[PDB]
């Protein structure tokens, strides 16, 4: 077994990363629901993935996903700010507290929309911006990717395993 939980601000696209990866293709209509996924990947590991979509606003229901978790992918959108902040103030406080010993990959999502059309006086989480955070909250590894391109997408799930 290996329990891996994908957590962070809604829309960034958790559901999607998970469906990109497991489905091995982008679908978009992009489904809302992603069932708990129990899989074999390659060294043969039994890999479990958990979406946390729809749990984000309900502070007493949401940490019910954290027990016996082997590793946490915390995510922000590389094209938000809104999210990147909440990593420091909400998600890391909560993971650390609920699970003092479980490691954390920090995942920057949407490297593809990273390079695109600042009206709102803001900037995309860049690679230094990211790792400064990763470092600040004691990450095990920092990554980036998109669900569309699937670039680095395969790296994330190899590193989540590596850490376990």
């Amino acid at each position: 077994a290996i329990k891996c939980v994908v957590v962070g601000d809604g829309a960034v696209g958790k559901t999607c990363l998970l469906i990109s990866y497991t489905t091995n293709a982008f679908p978009g209509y992009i489904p809302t629901v992603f069932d708990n996924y129990s899989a074999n990947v390659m060294k043969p590991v039994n890999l479990g993935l958990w979406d946390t979509a729809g749990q984000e606003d309900y502070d007493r229901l949401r940490p019910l996903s954290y027990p016996q978790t082997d590793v946490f992918l915390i995510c922000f959108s590389l094209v938000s700010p809104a999210s990147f902040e909440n990593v420091r103030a909400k998600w890391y406080p909560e993971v650390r507290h609920h699970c003092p010993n479980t490691p954390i990959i920090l995942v920057g999502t949407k490297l593809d929309l990273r390079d695109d059309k600042k009206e709102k006086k803001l900037t995309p989480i860049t690679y230094p911006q990211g790792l400064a955070m990763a470092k600040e909250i004691g990450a095990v590894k920092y990554l980036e990717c998109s669900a569309l391109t699937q670039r680095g997408l395969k790296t994330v799930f190899d590193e989540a395993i590596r850490a376990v």
Partner: protein, 372 residues
Amino acid sequence: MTEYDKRCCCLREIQQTEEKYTDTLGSIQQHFLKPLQRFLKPQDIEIIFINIEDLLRVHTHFLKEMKEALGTPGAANLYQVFIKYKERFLVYGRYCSQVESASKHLDRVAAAREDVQMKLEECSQRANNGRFTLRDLLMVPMQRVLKYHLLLQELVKHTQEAMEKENLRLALDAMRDLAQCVNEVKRDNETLRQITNFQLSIENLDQSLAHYGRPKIDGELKITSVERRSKMDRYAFLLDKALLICKRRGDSYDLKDFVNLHSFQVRDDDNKKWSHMFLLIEDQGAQGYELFFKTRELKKKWMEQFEMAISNIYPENATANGHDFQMFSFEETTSCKACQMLLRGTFYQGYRCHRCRASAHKECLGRVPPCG
């Protein structure tokens, strides 16, 4: 892909995930509960499986409803399956407030009885070819109840109308409302956990602490009264309706003075420690206390808590438009007479009018229609 194509890809999504959901529930009943009957005693099964059988009943009827609605109409009465089932779904309140201890109990029986541990492996092979443990399965309903809002959210943003969309948007609010009641049944569960601890240790105590609402802060202070007017080291519990002044040693706490917040008011006034003080004063009489704290920070926390307590006892608009609103614990499923969403939780969810008997959230009091 149109918006219309998109709209019709997720009415499918609603149906297939719901199908899969009732399937899982069926699986938990059939490949798990019924076999384990058989090894385990009633108590232990009651404990592990919570109200899962009932969830199964609720959702199969609901799947029927959903099917007919989606298939028979041109999808138009969908909103109304959701609205109709909202309050029957509060049963998730108990599931989510009991699932951690259902999980823990399973572990324990598991470790105590390896014939049970074997059967468990047997069971999840029979059921999902060993891909999911019974523990895993037990988190599923919590996941599911918190997805209806996102589904209808999605079905809203590819919805064609006016009128179709509004009552989908209604159906969304019913589902976000439910999620929130469920978030608060759990918070209240554990708030009540913490009160029970306050009760058990310890007591010269004659009523259930629950009667004075929710804990605010508790800790060590020295105190003066009119009757006794040198500094006494004490341990105090602040709840919404009362301060419990205790004497303080061990795990034992001895109740030595009980203050009713209804009748008291906070008035304030070295950076040498224990210098930092405010007063609680009676209005129609003559009791009064000086509360001393080790530290300005400690003052300062306690005052805010005192102010939150009294604001709960005596909120903005407790007397608007005729009413006389009181902190109340509703023991029956109840909605707000202004906003019409639910009062959330199992414990002091909001306010009742001592004259109307009307029910309302703290934030909705000025908006309640006038009474008679």
